[PDB]
Amino acid sequence: QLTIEMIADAFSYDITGFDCGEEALNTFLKEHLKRQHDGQILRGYALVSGDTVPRLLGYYTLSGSCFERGQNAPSVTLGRLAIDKSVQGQGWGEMLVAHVMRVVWGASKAVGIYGLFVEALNEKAKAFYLRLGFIQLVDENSNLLFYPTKSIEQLFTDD
Amino acid sequence: QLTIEMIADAFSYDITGFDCGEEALNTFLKEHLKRQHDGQILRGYALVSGDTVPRLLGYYTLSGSCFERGQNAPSVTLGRLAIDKSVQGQGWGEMLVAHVMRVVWGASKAVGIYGLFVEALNEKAKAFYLRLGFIQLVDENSNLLFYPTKSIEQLFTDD
Amino acid sequence: KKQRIDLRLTDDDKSIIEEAAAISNQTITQFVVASASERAAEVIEQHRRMVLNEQSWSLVMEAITQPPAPNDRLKRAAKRLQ
Amino acid sequence: ALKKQRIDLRLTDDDKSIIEEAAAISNQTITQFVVASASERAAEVIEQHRRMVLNEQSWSLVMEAITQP
Amino acid sequence: ALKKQRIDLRLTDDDKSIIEEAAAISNQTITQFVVASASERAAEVIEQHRRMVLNEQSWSLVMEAITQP
Amino acid sequence: KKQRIDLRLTDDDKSIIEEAAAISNQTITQFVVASASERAAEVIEQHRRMVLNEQSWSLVMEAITQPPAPNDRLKRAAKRLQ
DNA sequence: TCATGTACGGTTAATAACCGTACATTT
């Protein structure tokens, strides 16, 4: 009975034994998300279990962003996104991405937002987002992928 | 019985009623030289009388400088120069300029110094220094005049 | 001013911070807070500002003006969300 | 090479929040982010101060040279 | 507008000498040189802080927009 | 730190300095001394450094390598000095 | 064991901001 909720003030989650495969995303959980190093620039959402103490098996961070020509236009950027090994290969990684766009879509209804940016550190992450329809940018921006808000509109309208 | 001496720590000169025709050089005497606003960057010399309390009837300020191509070479710059009306039109102004070259001459024997710069605010100042042999510079440096050390060398060895 | 930051550091780092603060006519706390917060603003500004070249900018403009329809895998992920 | 020295800073809520999240973005502990930011700013100030001191002493040579009673 | 307020600074001999002599070069009293330098530096800090505050509040709308329980 | 500077200023100048010092996380004295001494160093270095263009630089070089003989009036001024 | 990051609170010596005071110009 997994659910997606926002990491609130408390952070009262059981993160003991969390492991996504990449230690950088693990240490970011124990040393930043667990200390509420967020709320003003980074906003975290969490994939949590239905246990009596909810366990965290995934998370992502979102931040308001803007892209410029060098005009200026606002956007949203998905920073980190991690899925615990226990629940990998089950589609939760793409469901979190679907929940990201849902928040972008919800945010776009109140403020102007033209799309969703993501930075692909390695080439597996690049293949992961390219598979979901993200458009990869070129040269200096070759490790950024973009998905427009109007495509997000089609995805939840139709569903 | 006028004498040229250096403005030392004390400054115990009678400067009451001093006036040089330009209030800017007057106020600089009452509001800077008399407060010992010098010793690290500006060095002042004084034309003083032989009274029981020596009266100040002239002064000049000197500062170490350097000129660059835009290499770098050191020089000396004559800043302000004032002669009280009481003793104007008698040659004390050029004798101070000759005294300026003498300390530059003495300074050049201990450290490398290639010449003497002076800034002529107006063109009367330009005519005053051009008459003594100063070479006027051009364009951005059109209110700068220069006299080389080797010409100063000639002046004092010959006499 | 109700928050706090506690730090452990080497004698070397503490010494050069103490002497640079003295040179700057600043307390240790002023020098450290100013150095960290000014550097924080640099990290944050690089994190939100996507400076796009003209080809990348054109790809974004193409995605905005001519938005693609979501593929089968992406729609399938949104149905499990719902 | 132990971290045997200490420093505590008392600051506003906004100063600590921008430092906390910038360290989170950089994926560094608060200690690394703050101590590294301060030391490297410290080394820059001392190097600049060292050049200015020797430059000013060079200017003081010309000052003493034109210093004649 | 009268100069009815006051400020006193305790400073090194080197800071006071470079301020005194720079005011002498500029042919300004110590009061003009010091208060003018501080007040236009103050206006620059006030202007930059006002742009930073309004920029930061602009970013906070996007933050609140993506803040959904 | 045995010297001092005393200031009279308007309420307007005093108020904006107090608020810029607060924004900068600095005392009034730190903000004023830093603003005045930084501007002092700018004034002093502009006063001693002569940036010469290529024509003016050549005139100086010509005066150095081929120094003129002092004219009669300058020679006359050094006579009264001695 | 020990080094370390994060965290809270008390003690004390140092001083920033202020205020009174003074004097000589300038208006």
Added chain:
DNA sequence: AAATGTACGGTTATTAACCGTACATGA
């Protein structure tokens, strides 16, 4: 009389820099 630039010294409320303390993790 009033405004102002420069100048000196005492008072007081604030706090920076230590230091002790605590806990949990990883070497």
